[PDB]
Amino acid sequence: ALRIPRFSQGIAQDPTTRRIWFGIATAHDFESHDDITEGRLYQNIFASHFGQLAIIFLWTSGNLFHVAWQGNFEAWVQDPFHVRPIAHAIWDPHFGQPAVEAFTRGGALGPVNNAYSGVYQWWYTIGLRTNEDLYTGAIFLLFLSFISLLAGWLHLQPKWKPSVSWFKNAESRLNHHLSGLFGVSSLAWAGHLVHVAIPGSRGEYVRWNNFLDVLPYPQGLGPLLTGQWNLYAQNPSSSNHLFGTTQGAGTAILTILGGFHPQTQSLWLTDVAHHHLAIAFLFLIGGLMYRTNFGIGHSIKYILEAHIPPGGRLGRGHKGLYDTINNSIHFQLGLALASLGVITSLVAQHMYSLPAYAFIAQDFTTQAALYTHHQYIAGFIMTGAFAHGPIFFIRDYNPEQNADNVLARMLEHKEAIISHLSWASLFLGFHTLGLYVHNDVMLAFGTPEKQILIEPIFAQWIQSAHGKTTYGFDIPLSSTNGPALNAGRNIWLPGWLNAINENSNSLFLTIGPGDFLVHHAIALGLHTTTLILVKGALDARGSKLMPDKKDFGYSFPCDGPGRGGTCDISAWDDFYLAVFWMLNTIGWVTFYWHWKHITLWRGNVSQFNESSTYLMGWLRDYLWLNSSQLINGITPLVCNSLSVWAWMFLFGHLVWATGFMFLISWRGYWQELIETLAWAHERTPLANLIRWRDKPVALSIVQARLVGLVHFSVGYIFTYAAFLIASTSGKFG
Amino acid sequence: TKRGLLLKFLILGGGSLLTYVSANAPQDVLP
């Protein structure tokens, strides 16, 4: 009975073990725990995530540091034929002498595991080449990632202000950012690719010495400032290229010209840079949009206030959404999450069909364990986005200060909102599930005919108004000509956005009734997943069963029995409940690519065609076909190619399953036998007197809903991790 | 039995010589 944990207090002298766990998971909840003030808090998240940026560079440093002395590079930059790159040297005393067996991979000596992250085709794809020329990485990034900590402290020290009120501006910042940051953060990138990289790509080197002496041309920046730009884009690249070595190089930066190549897919050298340039005006033009003292531009209210488009004469206000998104800090961290969440997939779904790297897809592995660590996350976000926008409603938010006002009304007219959401799901439910059992009752029954199978019309449609110049077809006003564009033609859409059907890497894959289902079952995901998050959110406040559900809103998990019987009815435990469908959408979706891709590589595509229109088969060929390689990899006949992976894959099936305890156990049963099991010691010799300092207990009644999960998840997400890789690696495909 | 401030000493010392030479070796007899 002492005093400890240095921030909370109720937690601090709790005699059990809760003392510990609950210590290590209240840490990051600054707003309201002993040590806090609106001044403290803000800054106490500020020099926190200055502790951020900081940890991101000790990551990146070492990423560029298990590479430069081993882990082929003055190899893989001789020509990157699909044979096993490298990450770092695996070194475990447990290893058998089959240290010698693959695991130990060709070029390098001691065993290793190869880059499935992209880094290897972008440390390269912006030039960065020679193995005497290369060994920087940490050296900079780290002589950086320490500065990242210095402000941390410097701006934590009172004196040279850590700034307090200055944290609720906007206008000034974001009038600064989306110019100063992004814009010049582009630009400066547009800078780099162009002076030092494009030359490093098509053309030749750049020598650490000269930087003035090197001049993309003979007669300099020539006109350029002379408004005359155009004559960049003439004989820019070629195609009879031999990537990296000139000769059919040509030298005129910028273009939109040429296009695809069996020797590298990937966006053209230049274009990723006029772009990076091109956008860098708009944000700079955008930055400079709001006040910042001098007396031009805008006040961020007064263009909300009575702005409003369909308001005006429809009795529906707009009061200080500013001093509630601003006085909120959660609204903040949740319009932040999403955007990021929506774009984390826009990143990672555009990062294929348009990968911008020297040898990538036509790699087809790194390409498929990189769409998903950007599909997991991304899904994993969204949830948290939806989860800090049901905290705003409880800790912050202010009915008297927001009312008639359009954030309310959203609350007020809520019972509908979840219903016209739930109506989507239940429809999108049984109607996908009619079509998939029916599709599976009919096979097995001997009749492959009778199969219900809708072409994805409005899909392929989008594309026969693009470039999918598949087997003709007019369309009234289009025909395939007469009218083409007329207004457009040999500018813009040249060879590009002209991949067509290209059975290899056409960008757009040619869609049929197999895709008119998954595509309606990713749709039944974010809908159901959100009826629960929308709901979860749309009353962390309270409701009929629990009316006054607040002052703590979020994680109060549980309530007494009686009333109807009341349970996981905290906006957390709906978040808790949400994360299962974000782990089921972000599964149907990823599942889908790959089966597709797999088949669309070292083989067919008919495969996904008549064998994704049903369900059994999704299990049989895929799931059951294409595991093969891995599992007979521990084999009764010695450790073959992969062994990390399949052991991971069963580590995968355990961490998972062992979720369930936590999940079908519920503190009551556990605590009680610990009541009997802590009559032991006390009553047994050679283990008496011997005192605990924390009183043996069973896990909190919210805690285990988490831990089963944060357990359910790794197992699950560590299984596909090991699954896809352990099968997109032989393949075949 | 001079325990008068120690243990930090025996956890760099002892445990840098159950692991310094303990891992290293002059000619493998490998993993």
Binding site: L2, W91, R693 | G15, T19, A23, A25, P26, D28
Partner: peptide
């Protein structure tokens, strides 16, 4: 001397842990 770079898995994966599982038993006491 020949072939000897094996100390940054115990100092980390082994000895660094010793430190903190010891040390951080500061959560109990110090």
């Amino acid at each position: 001397m020949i072939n000897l770079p094996s100390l940054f898995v115990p100092l980390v994966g082994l000895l660094f842990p010793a430190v903190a599982m010891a040390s951080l038993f500061l959560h109990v006491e110090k």
